[PDB]
Amino acid sequence: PLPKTHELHIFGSFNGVEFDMVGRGIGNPNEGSEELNAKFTKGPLKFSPYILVPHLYYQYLPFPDGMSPFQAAMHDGSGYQVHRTIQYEDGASVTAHYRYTYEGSHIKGEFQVIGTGFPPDGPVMTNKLTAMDWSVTKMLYPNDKTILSTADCSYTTTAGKRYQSKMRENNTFAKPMAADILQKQPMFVFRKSELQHSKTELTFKEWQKAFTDVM
Amino acid sequence: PLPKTHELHIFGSFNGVEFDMVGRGIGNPNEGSEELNAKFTKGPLKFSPYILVPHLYYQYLPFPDGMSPFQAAMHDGSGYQVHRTIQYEDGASVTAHYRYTYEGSHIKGEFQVIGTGFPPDGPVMTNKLTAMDWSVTKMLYPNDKTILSTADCSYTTTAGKRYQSKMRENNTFAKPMAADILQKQPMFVFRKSELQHSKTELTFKEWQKAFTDVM
Amino acid sequence: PLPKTHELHIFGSFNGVEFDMVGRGIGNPNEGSEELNAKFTKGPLKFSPYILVPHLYYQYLPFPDGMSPFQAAMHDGSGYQVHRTIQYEDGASVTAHYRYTYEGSHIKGEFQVIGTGFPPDGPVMTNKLTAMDWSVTKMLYPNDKTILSTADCSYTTTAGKRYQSKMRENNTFAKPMAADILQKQPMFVFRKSELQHSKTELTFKEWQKAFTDVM
Amino acid sequence: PLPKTHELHIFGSFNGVEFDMVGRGIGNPNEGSEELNAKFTKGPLKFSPYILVPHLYYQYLPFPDGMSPFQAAMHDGSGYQVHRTIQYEDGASVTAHYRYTYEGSHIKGEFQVIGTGFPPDGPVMTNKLTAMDWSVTKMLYPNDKTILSTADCSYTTTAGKRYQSKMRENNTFAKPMAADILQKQPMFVFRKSELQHSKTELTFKEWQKAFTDVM
Structure with missing residues (x-):
């Protein structure tokens, strides 16, 4: 089936210090929307919560003329895994690996998330991020x-200058994606x-829209 | 004024060998369309003409709410320059610098275009490129x-595998871009x-559309 | 003390397929040499064993004037962790995280090692790598x-062309490195x-030498 | 012949502003040493002179066992050209193309040098660079x-923090390099x-040493 609800377990470390968080949410797989709440287990995170945004569910993303490959792989249970790298302009790096299971x-x-090299005086460790800019992701299917x-x-x-990164990932499927x-x-x-x-929790929302064209 | 016609002069070298091209064209600055016909002036090109696509006029690009910064800088004559790098997956690199003058x-x-490190058996030097994929460019204004x-x-x-590159550029304006x-x-x-x-000539078309959102 | 023997548990996945290996060896912490042997647990690896080279112990590396920071962090037990990314020229990516314990x-x-995006017909998945070139790593201490x-x-x-990658890592220490x-x-x-x-085992050797100058 | 003296002409622009510099120097092609003096010809430099370092002669570099390919190509008159990109951590970029002629x-x-995207408050435009760190360049011969x-x-x-960049280049030879x-x-x-x-001039010195090993 298409998803209705989701839970998250995110664990790993930032600058060598372990963190662990759990959350729960819902979404609309016909519209590409989701929402999630997460209560901190033991006080605020030691870094900007905004750094977690990409780690806080493509199964909610439909494609223009049918299921996304993500939805198809959930629907038949075969699944996919995500392997992601993020390189930040001040030399920090995050690596991440997402695994999923489905129950209807x-x-x-x-989700394992490991970050290192965030400067202690930088905008992540000193909570100066204010929002993530809207984004366009390019997808190709090499095989x-x-x-x-x-x-x-x-x-x-808060300083007015943007904090930039390069995000790259593979999504690896157990079964081939469909011809469509x-x-x-x-x-x-x-x-x-x-x-x-x-200081005690966060609320997250995402809207996603697949497109081959805008003209 | 907004542009209606253009001429092209590309000069530079690929793998150490000089080339030169001249062309002329038209475009619709209210629709982001342009068309160019061009000819090689030092004999037949030693490399795939498709490598030239990005070098074959953002003055034709309107913005959603008004003139693009490119149009504004043409209209008032103050201008901009483009400084572009392209890094190809097989280790080749292109650098380019675009200067413009305006007459109504x-x-x-x-346009100076320099390419190096194209493998002699690669898809550029052996004419295996078949089309340029549709693209999305992200623009930010650091100042x-x-x-x-x-x-x-x-x-x-023709080998059925894509030939990928990372394209980056600065566009440097003589006058500040407007607040809008x-x-x-x-x-x-x-x-x-x-x-x-x-072997002697090409015809090129481009369509460009600025967007802040697709939702 | 300085290390004399070591073992390795390396696990993770390549192109979505789990692997797990154990190896053991020795090294000379005054000379920057080490050796490791490993039997394949459950049949041959599904990818070139050469891709494992960087993952197959800087505690064996002395510095030019005395102990390396790696050796110092082992001496006092405070330790360090390694967080590494490798980006390959054909679009594959490996991420890795190394944790250590010490017993005398x-x-x-x-060591957790996750690789994705290796083309099925590329040199890793078809065992065409023949050796790793000698290397120079540059180290800086941002804090x-x-x-x-x-x-x-x-x-x-085996094709007589090189297969290139960019390797980047942080080494994160629990205690500050020494002023010298x-x-x-x-x-x-x-x-x-x-x-x-x-088909059933590997043997690995490494020599490492720190230097600030060659003149 | 091997070189003993040299002159420099650098032209191009930084952040859209034209610059032009000339200088004269000497070197020792048996030892990999060179020195250059340049007087400023049209007023004070509008950016850190340290940014010019890589642009301020591999013909002075011998190889370990004989002439470098640079020296060979000067000596037989066939020559080489340099095509270089430098990407700075704050988003600035420099592209460069070096051509040479020889008179005994x-x-x-x-040397054409184009730089863009140097932040007006960054270390280049505010003259905070104090020295270039010693470097190791890796060379491969794809053909x-x-x-x-x-x-x-x-x-x-002056801030204590390093200002990092990635330098990449091709050196393209008119004639094959020696098989040896x-x-x-x-x-x-x-x-x-x-x-x-x-305020009125600079004096530059470089020492270069080729090596395949340090052990």
Whole structure:
């Protein structure tokens, strides 16, 4: 089935210090929307919550004329895994690996996220990020089981200068993607994120829209 | 004025061998369309004409709310320059610098293009490129006179594998871009390109559309 | 103390397929030499064993004037972690995280290594790598607990063309590095690797030498 | 012949503003040493003179066992050209193309250098660079007429933080390099630079040493 609900377990470390968080949410797989709440297990994170945005569910993304490959792989249970790198302009790096299991229309995510090299005086460790800019991701299918996706990402900051990164990932499928997917390349995805947080929890929302054209 | 016609002069070298091209064309600055016919002046090209696509006029690009910064800088004569790098997956590199002069609605381009490190058995030197994929460019304005634009570009080939590149550029303006430009970031631009070529000449078309959103 | 023996548990996945290996060896921490042997647990590896070379112990590396920061962090038990990315020329990516424990002069490594996007017909998945070229890594210390290390790496192949990658890592220390280490930047490290393998096992050797100058 | 003297002409622009500089120097092609003096011809330099270091003569570099390919190509008159890109960590970029002519043991260089995207408050435009760090360049020979060279470069600054860049170039030869050069890869080159400057002139010195090994 298409998803209705999801849970998240995100674990790993930033600058060598372990973190762990759990959250739960819902979404609309016909519209590419999702929302998630996460209560901190033991006080605020030691870094900007905004750095978590890409790690806070492509199963909610439909494609223009049917299921996305993500949806198809959830629907038949065969699945996919995500392997992502993010290189930040101040020399920090994040690597991430997402695994999923499904229980009918419920998704369970197990996301390992490792970040290093964030300067102690930089905008991540001193909580100066204010929002993530809207993004366009480019997707290509080098083979029938593999998506390569790239985006140039940026956050606004309290200082007014943007904090930029390069995001690259593979999405690796256990079963080939369908011909209706592979025949249309590149596929782009527009994404909007919203995050609010307090000292004790965060709320996250994302809107995603796949497109081959705007003209 | 907004542009209606243009001429092209590309000069430089690929793998150490000089080339030169001249062309002329037209475009619609209200629709982001352009068309060019061109000829090689030092005999037949030693490399795939498709490599020239990005070098074959953002003055034809309107913005959603008004003139693009490119149009504004042509209209008041203050101008901009383009400084572009392209890094190809097989280790080749192109650097380019575009200068323009304006005569009413006519644009004169002087574009220096230098390419090196194209493998002699690669898809550029052996004419295996078949089309340029549609693209999305992301633009940010790190300061009021500078655009940073990035795109992940790809060509289809006869070998069935794409030929990928990273394109990056600064666009440097003599006068600040207007507030109605600076206020809207990121700005994306969708581009479609068509190229036909023979041993002596080519015909090129491009369609460009700026967007802040697709939702 | 300085290390004399080590073992390795390396695990993760390549192109979505899990692997797990254990190896053991020895090294000379006054000379920067080490050796490791490993049997394939459950049949041959599904990818070139040469891709494992950087993942197959800087505690064996002395510095030009005394202990390396790696050796100092082992001596006092405070330790360090390694977080590494490798980007290959054909679009594949590897991410890795190394954690260590110490029992006297014995090192235990737990290394998670995840690779994706290796083309099925490329040199890794078809076992065309023949050796790893000698390398120079550049090290800088952006802060007193963090090393940033970069190298441009290359393998020879059976086709007589090299297979290139960009390697980047942070080494994150629990305690600050000593002032005498921090004072000498950049620090370079020359490395030579040797690997032999059959269908059932591999044998690895590495020599490493730190240097600030060659003149 | 081997070179003994040289002249420099650098032309191009930084952040859209034209610059032009000429200088004269000497060197020792048996030792990999050179020195150059340049007086400022049209007023004070509008950016850190340290940014010019890589642009301020590989014909002075011998190889370990004989003439370098640069020296061979000068000596037989066939020559080489340099095509270089430098990407700086704050988003600035420099592209460069070096052409040479020879008059006996005298080199004449014509170097086009274009830089863009240097932040007006960054260390280049506010003269905070204090020295270029010693460097290691890695050279490979993808074909018998082409060198690909890479280096991770860094300057010290008055802020204490290093200013890093990625330098990449091709060196393209009119005639094949000697067979006795081509199988010894990678070839590394260690470089030390010194720059003295006043309001009216600069004096530059470089030492270069090729090496395949340090053990």
